[PDB]
Every structure is written in C-alpha cells, then in structure tokens.
Amino acid sequence: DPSEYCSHMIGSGHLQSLQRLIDSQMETSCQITFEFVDQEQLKDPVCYLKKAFLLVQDIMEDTMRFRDNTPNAIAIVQLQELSLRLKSCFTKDYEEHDKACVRTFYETPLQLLEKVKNVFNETKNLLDKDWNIFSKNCNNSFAECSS
Amino acid sequence: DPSEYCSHMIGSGHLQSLQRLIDSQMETSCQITFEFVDQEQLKDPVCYLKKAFLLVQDIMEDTMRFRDNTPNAIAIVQLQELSLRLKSCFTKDYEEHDKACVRTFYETPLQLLEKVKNVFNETKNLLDKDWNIFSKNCNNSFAECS
Amino acid sequence: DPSEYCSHMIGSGHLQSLQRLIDSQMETSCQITFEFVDQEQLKDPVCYLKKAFLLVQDIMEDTMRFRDNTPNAIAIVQLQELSLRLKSCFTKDYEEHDKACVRTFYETPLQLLEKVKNVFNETKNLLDKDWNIFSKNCNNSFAEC
Amino acid sequence: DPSEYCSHMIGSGHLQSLQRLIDSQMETSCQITFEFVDQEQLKDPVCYLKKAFLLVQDIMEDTMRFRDNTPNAIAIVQLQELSLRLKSCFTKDYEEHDKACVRTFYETPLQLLEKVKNVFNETKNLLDKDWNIFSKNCNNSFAEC
Amino acid sequence: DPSEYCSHMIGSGHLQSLQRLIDSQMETSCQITFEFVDQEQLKDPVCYLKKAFLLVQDIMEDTMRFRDNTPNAIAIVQLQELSLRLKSCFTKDYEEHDKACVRTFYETPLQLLEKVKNVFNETKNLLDKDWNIFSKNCNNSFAECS
Amino acid sequence: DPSEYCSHMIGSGHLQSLQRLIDSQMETSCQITFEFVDQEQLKDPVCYLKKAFLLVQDIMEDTMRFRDNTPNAIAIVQLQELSLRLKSCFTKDYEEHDKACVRTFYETPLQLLEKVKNVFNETKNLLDKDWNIFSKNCNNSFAECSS
Amino acid sequence: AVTAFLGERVTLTSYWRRVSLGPEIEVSWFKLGPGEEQVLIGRMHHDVIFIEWPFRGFFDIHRSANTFFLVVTAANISHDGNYLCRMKLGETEVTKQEHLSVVKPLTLSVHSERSQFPDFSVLTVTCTVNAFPHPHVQWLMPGVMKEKDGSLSVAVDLSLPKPWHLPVTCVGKNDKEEAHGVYVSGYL
Amino acid sequence: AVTAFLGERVTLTSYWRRVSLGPEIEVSWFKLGPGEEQVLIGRMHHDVIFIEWPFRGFFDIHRSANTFFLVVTAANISHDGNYLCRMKLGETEVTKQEHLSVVKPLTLSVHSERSQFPDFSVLTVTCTVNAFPHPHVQWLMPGVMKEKDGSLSVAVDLSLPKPWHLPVTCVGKNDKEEAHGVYVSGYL
Amino acid sequence: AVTAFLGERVTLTSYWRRVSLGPEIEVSWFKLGPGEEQVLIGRMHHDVIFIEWPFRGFFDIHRSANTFFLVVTAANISHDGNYLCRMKLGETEVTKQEHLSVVKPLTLSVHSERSQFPDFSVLTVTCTVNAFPHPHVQWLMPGVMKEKDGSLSVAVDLSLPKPWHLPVTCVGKNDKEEAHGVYVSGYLS
Amino acid sequence: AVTAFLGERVTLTSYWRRVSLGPEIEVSWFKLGPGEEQVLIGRMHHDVIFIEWPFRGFFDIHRSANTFFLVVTAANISHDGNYLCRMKLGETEVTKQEHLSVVKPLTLSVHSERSQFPDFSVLTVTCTVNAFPHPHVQWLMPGVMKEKDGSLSVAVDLSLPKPWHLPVTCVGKNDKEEAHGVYVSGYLS
Amino acid sequence: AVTAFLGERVTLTSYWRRVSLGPEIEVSWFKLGPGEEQVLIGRMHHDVIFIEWPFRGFFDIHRSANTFFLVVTAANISHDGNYLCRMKLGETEVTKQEHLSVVKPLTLSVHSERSQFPDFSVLTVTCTVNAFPHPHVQWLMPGVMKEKDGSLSVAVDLSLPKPWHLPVTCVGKNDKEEAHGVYVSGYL
Amino acid sequence: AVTAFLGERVTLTSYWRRVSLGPEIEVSWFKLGPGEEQVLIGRMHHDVIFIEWPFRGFFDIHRSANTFFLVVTAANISHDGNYLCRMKLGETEVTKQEHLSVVKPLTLSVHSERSQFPDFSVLTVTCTVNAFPHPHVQWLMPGVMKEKDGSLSVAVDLSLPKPWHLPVTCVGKNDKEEAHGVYVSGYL
Ligand SMILES: *[C@@H]1O[C@H](CO)[C@@H](O[C@@H]2O[C@H](CO)[C@@H](O[C@@H]3O[C@H](CO)[C@@H](O)[C@H](O)[C@@H]3O)[C@H](O)[C@H]2NC(C)=O)[C@H](O)[C@H]1NC(C)=O
C-alpha cells in the first residue's frame, strides 16, 4: 500500500518552514509538557522514526498553535495536509502498541520544536532513499519497550 | 533638542516588524515576569509614553531575545538603533522619578510584545501630530505615582 | 339590697376610733406582709372600695390584733359589726373575681392602718353623697386587673 | 440627795398610762433592738433598778416614739418629767460603770414596754416601803457585771 | 512389751560417745535447720521424751553424718542399734499425733548435738527409775499441741 | 639461723592429731571465710609451703577453736607450741610481701581442715629432707604475685 | 415576677397570715424540679436556719416578723423556675409557690469572611447571639447550642456575591431585648 | 461571743438606735484585716444589697426593722476575727465592731509503731491533735503544722522500752475542749 | 501591595530579569525580623527546593519560568511583614523586597449589664472589637488586649442613667473595615 | 508463726533435711494466690538467684547451709498470706508451706460535731479505727472501708442529747491490739 | 518512581494536552484509599488554589504552564499510595493516576545480654531492624511492631552457649537496602 | 572484679576473722561518694537487719556464718563505685573496702540519610553507640549525650559523595566489648 510518491511528499519547503518556527520563537526559561517517543526505549532507527513521525502528527494540533492566517499557522496547516497525504506510506502495527514507547517531557517550546524538526528531517531522508521503508513491521521493536 | 526630524523616525516598517514578532510566537500558557509602567498610576497619555520609553531599551535586551541573524533578532537590533535616534526627542525629567510609576507584570510573552508594540505605535502617532510633544514636563504626573 | 340606712351607717365615732389606733401605735421601722387590694390594678374609686370591703373583714382578724376587752380591741369588734351591717349596701359581683385586684404588701403596721382607715373614710364620703353608689356593677373593673 | 418626796413621786396615773401604751399596741411579731440593763449580769433588785433608771431616759427618746400631742406622746413627756424629778432620789455611782450591766435585746415593741413598765412598777413598790432605798451604793453590784 | 531389760540398754558408754561428738566439733557461727520436738508445747517430761524418741533415728541419719569407720561414725552406728533395742520400751500412741508437737530450729550443730545428748540422758535416767515409764499414754499431751 | 633440729619438730603425732580434727567433724553444707595463700599465684613448691605454713600458724587461733581441755583443743595448743619452736627454721623475707599471695576462701570447715593438714604434711616432708630448706629467699616468688 | 439577671442577688418571699406570728412557723423552701419533684433547699424554725449542703452559699433564708425570705446570693441559669415554701404551724400547713425568672443579657457578634474558592468574591457575614432564655438571630434581607453556663447560642450566615450590597443588618433578640449588628464595609 | 463552729451558719448584728428608722441607714460591713485595714464585704441601703465579688456566697446581708445582719453561710477559719459595721444616716455615722470566733473541733489520733533496729523491743506511740485555734498534745508520764483549711496539727511521740508499761494516755486539748487517746496493748 | 486574610493561601514573587533564565538562579527567601534581621525560610536551585524546618509546612517555594514563588500555605498574624528574596547567578546577586499584609476581619460584639448598687437603674452597654491590624471602637453620644492568635481586642463602656436613651450606636473599625453595633431595647419594659 | 508489721523486713525459711546438702538443691519460692495458685517469686540453684521481675526489689532469696531464706524487704498488706517452697534434688522433690502475717498497727481517732438543725444541742462524737487485719470500733453506753494501702477503716457515731453525758469511751481493736478514745469535754461551757 | 524518603519534599505532576491552555483547567487532586474512596486534597482553577483543611500544610498545588504540581511538603508514611488528578475543561475531563513511594531508611541495632539463670554462660545477641516498607532481619547461622510514625520494627534473637562462637553477623534489609551488624566480642 | 551487668543481682561480701563469731558483729555497709562522704546503706546486728529508707528494695543484707553479704537486687548505673563495710566487736572495728563495676552492654545502630540540598547525591551514614562506662564509635576510613538511665551515647557521621563507596564499616566499643555496623547498600 505504500508507493513511489512516498519519496516525494516531504519537501525542503516543509523543512524550511519548520526552521522558521524555531528561528522566530522568543527565548524563555519556560516549560510545557508534551508526549514524545523516547529514544532510550526505541533504539531501532526506522521504527523510532516511524512511531515518532506518526506521534508528531497527532500531537501537532495541541502543541503547535499560532493565530490563524499567520505564516506559522499556514506552515502548520500545510504539515497537517501533508500528514493526510502520507497516510498510505506507513503501514499500521498492532493496536496494543499504541501507547508503547511513549513518554512525557517537561521542556521548552524551542526544545519541542527542535525535536519535531529532527523527526521531520530524518523521516524525509529515509523516504528519499526508500519509499517503502515504513512498510516495516515494527511490532518487535515496540514490544521491547519499556527496555 | 527635539526637532521636526522626530516625526520621521518610527516608520511603519518598525511597526510591521513588531507585528511579525507577535504573529510568529507559538501559543502557550507560559508566563514571565517583567517590569513595566503602571497604566493605573500614569494615566496621562504623554507622560505614560515618556516613562515607557525610558524602560523600553533594557526591556528589549532582557525580555526579547532571539538567535542571531534571525529576522526577529534583526528586528530587535533595528528597534534598538531606533531608540538611540529617538533619544533626542524625549527631554529628561527629574532623576528622583526614575523608579516611579513602575510595576511588575506576570504575563504571557505575547502580552509583553503587545505592550511594547503599543508604546512604539502611540509614540509614532503622537509624534506625527507634534514633533515636540515629548518635551512635555512630566515631573508632576510622575509625582502622582503611586 | 341597699337602702337609705347606708347613708349614715359609718359614723364619725367609727372614724375617731380608727384615728385612735393610728395615734396609739409606736413608730418603728417594723414591716409585716398582708394581702390588700392593688390600687395600680384597680383605679376606679367605687370598685376599689367595693373590693377592699370584701377584704377588711379578714384583714382585721389576721392583722389588727389586740387583747380582749382593750379599748382598741373593742373598736375592732365594732368595726367587725359595722362591716356586717354593710354587707347589704354592696351587691355581689362574679365569684371568678374573688382573687383579682389583690396583692401582698410588705409594709409598716401604721401604713396598714392608714390603708384600712381610708377605706372607711372614702366609703363614708361617697356614701354621704349617694347611698346607692355600691350597687355599681364592678365585674368589668375587676376583670381589667 | 433624797427626801420623803420620793415616797410618792410615782403615782398610779403614771402606771395606768404605761399600761395604756401596752394595751394600745398592735400584736405583731416585729422585733427591734435596744440597749437595756442585763438581768443575768445584774441580779440585785435595788441596783438593777438604779441602773435601769440611768437608761430609761435615753430608751424612751429613741425607742418609744409617738406623734406630737397624741395621748401616748403626752404620757411619754410626763414620764420624762417624772424621771427628771427622780434624779435626786438616786445617788451617783462611779462613772467607770456607765456601760456595765448593759446589753442589747432583739425583741418585740410590747416586750420593750413590759420591761420599761416593770422598772416603774418595781421602783414604786420599793419606794413605797423605803424612800431612801436608792441611796444604796451599787459600785460593787455594777462591778460584778 | 516393755520390760526390766529397758533399764539396762542406755549405758554410760553411749552417753560418753555423745559427749565426744560434742567435744570434738570445731566452733563456728554456722547454723543449720532441723526439725525437733517443741519444748514450749510438750512440757510434760515423759511425753516430751516419748515424742523426741520417735524422731531421733531420722534426725541422726539426716543431721549427724560422719565419714565411715571414724570414731564418731561408729558412735552413730551404735546409737542407731540402741534405738532399735529401745523400740520395745515405748508403746505407740495415736498416729494422728505423728506430726504434732514438732518445730524447726535454726541452730548450731553443737546445739543440735546437745538436744540429742539430752534425750538419751533423760531417757536413761527416767528408765533407771522405772523400766515401764514410757508405756505412759501420751495421747492427751500430744493433743494439747499446739 | 636454722639448724638440724628443724628436721625433728613436726612429728607423726602432730599429723595424726590433724587427721583427728578432720575425722571428728560433722558433715554440713556450711561455709566460713578464711584467708589462705592461693596455689594459683604461688607455684614454686618451697615458697608456697614457706608462706603457707607461716600463714596457717597466725590464722590457727581465729579459725580452729575447740572447748578448753578437749582432745582437739589440746591438739591445737600443741600445734601452736610447735609453731614457736619452729621460729628459727623460717628466715624472714621482705615485710612488703606480708599481704602478698594471700586470698580469701569461702569454704567448709572440713575444707579448711584439709588444707591445713596438707600444708603440715608437706612442710614436714620438706624439713625431713632438708632442715635448711626454709632459709630460701622467697622474695622473687612473692613479688610474682599476683600472677 | 420576679426577674433577676445572671449574677444578681434576688429574694423570693412568703409570709404567715396571722401577723402575730413568725418564729414559730416551720418554714421550708423547695426548688421544684421537673416535675412533681421537690428538692429541699433549707429550713427555718425558731430562728435556727439550716441550708442543705448542695445549696449552701447559693441560697439563704431569713425571717423578718411574719415574713420569710429565700435569698439567692448570685442568680445563675439553673435557679430559673418554680419554688415552693411550706409553712407549718402545729398541724396546719399553708404552701406558697413562686416563680423566678433568670435572664442573661444577650451578646450579639458580627464578623465576616471572604471565600477562598473558586474565588475571593463571596462575602459571608456571620451573626451570633448568646442569651437566656430565648436567643434569636436573623439577617434582614433585600441550631441552638447549650453553653457551660446554661445559656444558649444561635448563629446565622449570609453570603453576598459581587457586588456586595452593604451595609447589611442582623437583628438579635432575647425576648423584648434587641440589638443589631451591621456590617458596613469590607477591609479591601 | 459570737462563736461558730467550722461549717456553721452564723450572723453578726448591728442596729440603728432610733427604732423609727431602718432602710434609710447606709450600712456597710467590713472584715478587719491585720491591721488598721478594713475590707469591704457588702453594702445595704434602701433594701438594695450588694456583696463584693470576693465575698459573694460566703457572706450576705439583710435588714429587719432597725436591725442589720451579716450572715456567714458556712463559717471557715479565715472568717475568724473582727468585723466593722458602719451605719450612716445623712451626715452622721455610728460604727459597731464585732468579733467572730471560728472553732474547728479537735481530732485526736493514736497509733503505735515498734522499732526495727537494733531490735523490735521499743514501742513508739504517736498522738496527733488537729484543731483551731489552739491544738495541744501531751503524753502523761510515769512544732505546729498549718493545714490547707487553716487549722493546726501538733504531734508528740513517746518511746517505751521493754517491758512496755501499758496503758499510756495522751491528752488532747483545744481550749476547754478535751479528748484522750489511750494505747492499751500491742498486737504481739 | 499584597494582602491576605488570616487562614488564606497567599503568594509572594520575585524574578530574574533575563527572561530566558530560570533554574540556574540560586534563590533564597528570608523573613525579615524586627532588627532588619534575615531568617532563612528556604532555598531553591535547579528545581531542588529545601525549606528550613521551623518553616516547613508553613511556607513553600516553587519556580515557573523566570519567576520565583513563596507560598504561605495558611496566612497567620506572625507572617505579616517583610520578606527578602536573594537571587544569585555566578558572582552576580540581586535582591527583591516584598511586604505581606495579614488581616483578620473584625469581630464586633454588643452586650449590656444593669447596675446592682445603689440600684438597678444604670445600664452599661459594652462594645468590643477584635481585629488585626487596627481594631478601634467608639460609642456615639447624643486598654488594648493581645490575643493568643496575635490579634488585638478593644472595648468601650457606655453608662446610661434612667430613663435609658435607646437606641445607642457603637462604631467599630479595622482600617477601611467597618461594623456597627446598636443596642435597641432592654429585656424589661 | 511469723508476723511482720507494715514496712518491716521479714524472713521466711525452708530447708533441706540432709544437713550436708545446700547449693545442690534447686529452690523455687511461690506466692500462693486465692485459687490455690502458685506465682513464681524466684529461683535459686548453686547460689545463683533469679527473682522474677514483678517481685524484684520486693523479695530476695539467699541460702545458708541447708537453709533457704525468702526475704521480703518491706512488708506490705499484699504480702499477707501463704508461700510455697519447692526443693528438688535429682528426681526427688519436697515442698514446704509458710504463712506470713502482715499487720498494720491500728490508728484510733476521736472527733465531734454538734447539730445545726433543729438546734445546736445534740453532740455527735465519732470514733474511727484504721488497721489490718481486723479493725473494730465500739462506743461504750452508760460499713468497712477499704484504703489504698490495703488496710481497713471502720467508724461509729454516738449522738448525745443535752445535757451531754461526758466523758464517753470508745474502744478500738485490731486483734489483741487495743486503744481507747475518750471525749472528755466540749469547747463551750 | 516516584520515590521519596521520609521528610523529603516531593512533587507529583500532571498536565493538560493542549499546551496553550493552563489556568482554564479545573484541577483537583485526590488521595486514593482503601479501597476505592477518593479523598479531596485540594483544587486549583484560574490560579486560585484551595487546600482542604485536613491536608493544609502537608500538600500544596501550583501551576506552571499547562503543567500541574502536587507538592507534599514533608513526605510521611501515610503519603505512600496512589493519587488521582482530575482535569476538567467545561464538558471534558481527563484523569491521571500517580503512585508515590515513601521510604524510611533502615536502622539496624545490635546489643547483647548474658543470662542470669541458671548461670551467666549463655549470651543472647539481639538484632533489630526498623524500616519502611519492608524491614527484614536474620542471623547468619554457623513479631512485627508498628511504630507511631507508621514504620515497622522486627527483631531476632540468637543464643550462644559457652564457648561463644564470636564474631556473629546479623543481616538487615529493607528492599535493596542492606546493612550488617557484627558482634565481635563481649565485655568480660 | 566484682562486675555486674545492668539489671543483674550481684553480691558484695565481707567477713569476720574469728570464725566462731557471727551475729555478735555489728555490720554496716556504706556507699562511698564524691569524694569522701560515706552514705549508710544499712545495718545488721544479731540477725536484725535494717536498710535505710532510700536504699530499701535496692539493697539487702544478710549473714551466713562469719560472712556478711551486701545484695544489690538489680544493678543500676548509680551502683557503680566503692563500698565500705564496717565491722565492730565492742571496742574493735575492722574495715573492708569493695568496688562494684556496673556495665551496660553496648547498643550499636546504623542508618543512612541522603541529602536534600543542593541535591540528593550525598549519603551521610550515622553510627551510634550507647554503653556504660566507655562508649566509643568510629568510621573506618578508606558530643556525649548522658541518658536517663545514667548511660552514655555517642554518634559519628560519615558523608559519601557520588558514587558511594559502599560497603562502609563503623566500629563500636565499650572497653573490650566490640561490635561493627556495616552499611552495604542504599535503597535506590
Ligand atoms: C448554679 O447554682 C447551683 C446551685 O444552686 C450550682 O450547683 C451546685 O454546685 C456546687 C459546686 O459549686 C455543687 O457542689 C459540689 O458537689 C460535688 C459533687 O456532689 C462535690 O464533689 C463538690 O465538693 C461540690 O460541693 C452542688 O452539688 C450544686 N448544687 C446543686 C443543687 O446541684 C451550679 O454549679 C451553678 N451553675 C453554674 C454554671 O454556676
């Protein structure tokens, strides 16, 4: 169900826009909590990114809010649109692993943004090499959590 | 020592840059403490701005920090330079009134930005009407604080 | 069942004898308690007098005591007779009011005597004027107490 | 400084008037307190009488009070005169004994009157017999109190 | 069952042996407890001895112990044998009176020995006067104990 | 100052008499306290006996009492007499060692008597071999107490 | 009558009708418990007076002429109620019953307290009335506690939301006794 | 006089000489402390009686005719001493002084105890007298302690060696008051 | 200006001026005593908080962003007064002062008492105010006591001869806080 | 028969019959309780003594020769009663019983009181005896209370009408122990 | 975790998922108890915090951004257990459960006692461990008291006859916590 | 010796040198104190024993033959010290001095505590020794409290930074008495 166009969804436009969010934020000593997959439990590079990327999408609406019609709001609208188009690029794993490998972080908005950008950057690189990479059965990796 | 020139310093480019700082901030329930002019104590519009302006430079440096050569960082650099130019336009009031009319706020970064945008904006507008407006003697209004 | 007898039932000799009692008592600060008619409760002079009269009978027996055959004892015996002669000149009022308008007093023997004398003195005055005065229905007066 | 006057200084009219006081008082349980001579301390009849006499003067003023011009008031005024006439028939004894043999009593007005009457009644008796009887030196009697 | 013979059993040899037990004991302030007849309760001389004698055998065995074939040990052996012979001379009184008239003493060994010497000595003397003396009926005297 | 007659003072008569005391005592569980030299502190055979014997003499009057004119009283009188005659047989040591090597015992009169008899028996044996034995300077032994 | 306030000296009286008499009457006082139940306080005969130990110092008795007095030295709440005086001469007895009312004057208190959740906008004003016999509280609009001394306390709360409509008045009552507490302004 | 025993009701009296008067006299009672020192107990004028709080319930006052009474409800030892009654009519004053004697009847006790060293042969008999004002003890032959109630206790010991010469008598006294304690035989 | 009522939770703040800083600031809160003395309440550094034992449970400290909170968990009268917050980054120290006002809402009471000698005709009405900081009472005409909780009580008497001039008004004050007491009628006619 | 007075040291003994024995006997002393029950006071064997904790300081045990002593250090009323001593040598056991009598010397008191109603003429003289075991009181003519120390108190009243027949004699008893109380004269004439 | 030691300040956290919300969320923290009851600790809404009176001074609550903190000011043993945070935004409620482990570090004690009967030759040595939650003691071979502070104590005895095999070792544990007691020699 | 442990029955002895005497000797035992005072414990003569009231139940005295015994029924720390027995026969007195050592066996305790500021990385472990007469503690390296019972407590702290060098050993001593405490691991 993944096909060749999976290599040609995430563009440099999306990434540049992610850098924009980061570059525009005021530096504060301020912290929010959010979920994210922890790299200490999910070490396999493909599966970490597979899970991570899907998590970033369904966390986006709650964690990445800007005023409507603003450049960053528009950037977020485009990432979300892009998520829907990536649908068939990730094959589903066992639903028992939905809450698996996930953890909360009490960090800065800038630090949230760094994480999201890197998941994006790395998910794009993988897809550019192999449009079929995320058809990987990730169940064994997900079960290894919480190790 | 103010002059006609004062009417020509705060351009609408500055104000759009302030709006871009605002529009680009991510929405959190995050709050920060900063010191600013008490609008409950300084009601007089001219005197409020005279005071706000003597705080705006330090406010910027300590509260509005961006990564270098970033658009928002550059905007702050240009707002800093503007504030040197505008020096000429405000006549000094008694030093006894340096810490008067001031208040801490526990507010959102977006709310800080809006306060700052408003100073510049009203300072522009007042100055568009009268290049000499901020040569007002504000010693009495300051004394009425608290 | 009154008559024109009542006009001069109480003579001046009856009054002199009362004043004799008062004149003959020793002045002390002694006080005794006795039941009498309450003048604050019972302001109407006619009904006051009628009430007082149904009491001076017992009052005299219990409160005004002298040794047999003494001048003052005699004057009491006659005042007992006078009161027995006066039972027709006052008509009866509802028995429900037998204890009404009555009150104890903690007073001097002489003060008691002043009270008792004035019942007779004031009765005689009104009785000199109208002999039928104590046919007055006092049921309402007594009822106000 | 006695004489044969003293034999009949106190008449029977003086005694009748005393008994009149007693007869005319109301019987109550009132009690008053008064100083009189102590009969347990001072048993000798002659000296008792002498002592009592130096007291009935004041006793009467403070204890036997009646309104001016009353029969009983008059009888007191005369008993005051009688006592002033009797000051010669008793000779003085040491002043050191002015408070001796004396005692307060918490008693009835009538009981006081009985006391005062007996001073006069018993004085008269002894005075009828011997007119010079109260020239008796009572210094020793009083001293025994 | 007593007879003339009873007058001839306690010899003065026995009594000298008892005196040798006494004379040979070292003087200490040592005290021992033993049970004996209460002289305060049995005053009667004959009855006292009748009773003392029913105790003397056990008293000896438990209280007067010497090393074997020693002179004092031999003396005790001969006093034991004498007591068997003297059995005949005492008639038995009610068994109800076996524990009556008895008392514990907390005394010196020398004082124990003296009590024992006295029983034998007075028993000898009484028996010298009347071979039949200890056929006395002592049931009443015993009953008066306590 | 000791001479040959020191071999011929303590006779078998004295010893037999000591046995008599022992043999005549009633057996009791009774105890007295007395001083005696302890064999644990004074191990040297000669010096133990030298000290022991002298101690037995000046303890005799207080610990070994019988009624006057009794055979055992007479025995004790003779031991005491014998002590005076033995005077020059024991040469004196340093007076600082008077209280040395001595100890109390809480024992039976029979046990006291056993000890005394053995000191006697052994002191006699030594003297029979050497009338001069107790001229031994015992100061070194006495100083070793309390070891 | 009679009425005494808490802490006051008060007397109840009785008397012998024959004015000629006094000391010869055997007089006994009773405090009437609840109910059909009489408790001896004290007796008086021939000027000898004996007060039962439980009432000793709280009550006394004396006579003047034909008149007999029951004195309460310092009225307390327990003393409130009926009394019986039995008067006995030889074989003949007359009894007088008397009622004594003991009153404690009221104490009215007002205080306020603001809310701590969900905000500080709600002002609760509390009005307390202590009294005997009949404490009564109420707030004028746009249970009972027994104290150690026998008196009664009652309290009412009034909650005001923003903006507080001050002043507010509570009326406190005993019977005819009346006091007000008025809360006029908060501290801010 | 007067004399009261501990716990008894007792009255001190005073009076106005003019028999005609009574309620009009201002009467005040004082307990006289040591010394030249007067302490107000209570006042009476026109039949209003007020007792000072420290004496409330221990003293009361009443009047009959010209006669004034100071009643002590239950005499205690502190009440023993002098009293002053000041009587005031207009500008004129007369004072009466009265003495009150309070007596506590004596309690005599006897007990014995034998020695425990050097032997049990010595019998010590102890006689104790409690009283007010004047307890006194003594053994008939061949200091003071103040109690909480204000009374005094005194004790004497008698030691008997063997053979004990029993019985032995101690006499206890208050003033004229006298009791004996006699120890007749030991327990053995 | 921060004011708390007795029993309330209340918060005092200080802050680091550079908004991007927070956990790096060593923070110590002091209660200022009457000799200008500093008593250490507690310290904070990198979101590790330690509250001195005499203050434990009465005060707490937390941070959010560049802001440093002193929480008093239940304001009591002792807590009224000044506080000092010392903030250090490396060699640089800045201090902030904060005054806390603790207020106890006033209680106003009215009661009366009639005289017992020479007669019963004088009515004495009493008005009492308890409060903190400044209780004040006063009768309107035609000594300060210290309580165990730290509050102050004041009382005034008004003696009225017969016939009693009633009603009578009593005015009580804390600062701006105000209550009235009215004695309207006595118990007997 | 052994008797001790309250507060006295007192000794009870048992013994081994064979006089040459002593330290070898295992000795245990018991206090007998009201159900014939044995409560262990303490044990002794080879001059090692152990006293049970509830009895420590109140009882001690020692031996001399064949004799075994139970020392009660200060006799109190609870100690009155029986004791049992069990002695064992190997399989052979013998027991001795001992009763201890504890006695408290009697206290006799006299006091009086006159009546207060209907008059002061009746004199009531009171005689009281405290003791243990058997206090007894009695007035000579022309309920038992339990004290905290275990002793017993008894009292009798004698009411005398006027004129008072004085002197009056009171006789108190423990057992053989005897005291008299005489009331000789009252305070007033 | 989270684990706290006795006396430590410790913190439980919860959060709202929409990062832009904070004060709007109605927050309430509950201590969960045997076995389904929830006891309200306190509430927070719009930065108004009210801690229920029983938990006052023991617990506090504050907000940071979208993050909510339960502070337990000095962990005591009663605080060991589950907690529930209830977050409400109008109609939506989300719930978070959180467990706190309170731990009391172990105390190990050793002391000896020689026997007193029938002789003094037996040494019994005692090892005591107090901890929370799981104290456990034992002797290495050749009765649970519950304390006031909620902690548990256990003790073991070892009896050595002569001659004593010293040294002897006791082992005390909590969970992973371990200490030893060694008795090396007696006093003599 | 003689040495006794806390709580033990112990015995001091004295004797008369003439073995035939016993009861005749007047015996008295004294506790010697700071620094020359002699306090009479009790007396014995002719088998009569009297123990002074302050020592009653703590000490007793008895005789055997010529031998005299002081029993201290339950050795407590105050009993540690010198004793004097005075023996008198008419004119002759002989004296004997005797020392009693009371010993309380040591208790050794170990427990740990992690730091709370500026972080939780420091472990300080505490070792406590209570004994009599000479408690002494120390840590083997890679403040004397006096108790109610007269015994002494001492304590030492050791502070370990991360990473903790466990196990660590504490050494506790009395005199020849020795125990060790070993902290093997923390809880985590
Ligand atoms: C109000 O007045 C009554 C009396 O009319 C008070 O009751 C009395 O209070 C006294 C104590 O002051 C009681 O006496 C006590 O009795 C106990 C126990 O029986 C005794 O142990 C004490 O030594 C003491 O004598 C007395 O019994 C009691 N009288 C009655 C009739 O109950 C009452 O206390 C007063 N109430 C208040 C709040 O003041």
Curated annotation (Swiss-Prot), chains B, E:
Disulfide bond positions: 6-89, 47-138, 101-145
Glycosylated sites: 121, 139
Domain of life: Eukaryota
Protein's UniProt name: Macrophage colony-stimulating factor 1 43 kDa subunit
Taxonomic placement: Eukaryota, Metazoa, Chordata, Craniata, Vertebrata
Location of this fragment in the whole protein: 36 to 179 of 554
Swiss-Prot record, chains C, D:
Disulfide topology: 6-89, 47-138, 101-145
Residue positions the entry lists as glycosylated: 121, 139
Designated name of the protein: Macrophage colony-stimulating factor 1 43 kDa subunit
Annotated organism of origin: Homo sapiens (Human)
Gene (UniProt): CSF1
From Swiss-Prot, chains G, H, K, L:
Primary location: secreted
Keywords, ordered alphabetically: Disulfide bond, Early protein, Glycoprotein, Immunoglobulin domain, Oncogene, Repeat, Secreted, Signal
Ig-like domain: residues covered: 2-101, 105-188
Glycosylation sites: 76
Segments traversing the membrane: none
Gene Ontology MF terms: identical protein binding
Keyword Secreted set for record: yes
Post-translational modification as stated in the protein's UniProt record: Phosphorylated on serine and threonine by host.
Cellular component aspect of the GO annotation: extracellular region
Intracellular or extracellular location(s): Secreted
Gene3D superfamilies named among the record's database cross-references: Immunoglobulins
Disulfide bridge map: 127-170
Function noted in UniProt: Plays diverse functions in immunomodulation and oncogenicity, maybe by acting as a functional receptor for human CSF1. May inhibit interferon secretion from mononuclear cells. Exhibits oncogenic activity in vitro.
Quaternary structure and partners: Homohexamer. Interacts with human CSF1.
Name this polypeptide is given: Secreted protein BARF1
From Swiss-Prot, chains I, J:
Keyword flag Thylakoid: no
Keyword Glycoprotein (UniProt): yes
Molecular function in Gene Ontology: identical protein binding
Species per Swiss-Prot/TrEMBL record: Epstein-Barr virus (strain GD1)
Keywords: Disulfide bond, Early protein, Glycoprotein, Immunoglobulin domain, Oncogene, Repeat, Secreted, Signal
Subcellular location: Secreted
Xref: Gene3D superfamilies: Immunoglobulins
Positions of glycan attachment: 76
InterPro entries per the UniProt record, alphabetical: BARF1_Ig_2 (IPR054777), Ig-like_dom (IPR007110), Ig-like_dom_sf (IPR036179), Ig-like_fold (IPR013783)
Cellular component, GO annotation: extracellular region
SUPFAM superfamilies recorded: Immunoglobulin
Post-translational modification: Phosphorylated on serine and threonine by host.
Residues passing through the membrane, by range: none
Disulfide bond entries: 127-170
Assembly mode: Homohexamer. Interacts with human CSF1.
Ranges where the Ig-like domain occurs: 2-101, 105-189
The name this protein goes by in its record: Secreted protein BARF1
Pfam families, per the entry: BARF1_ig2 (PF22305)
Protein function: Plays diverse functions in immunomodulation and oncogenicity, maybe by acting as a functional receptor for human CSF1. May inhibit interferon secretion from mononuclear cells. Exhibits oncogenic activity in vitro.
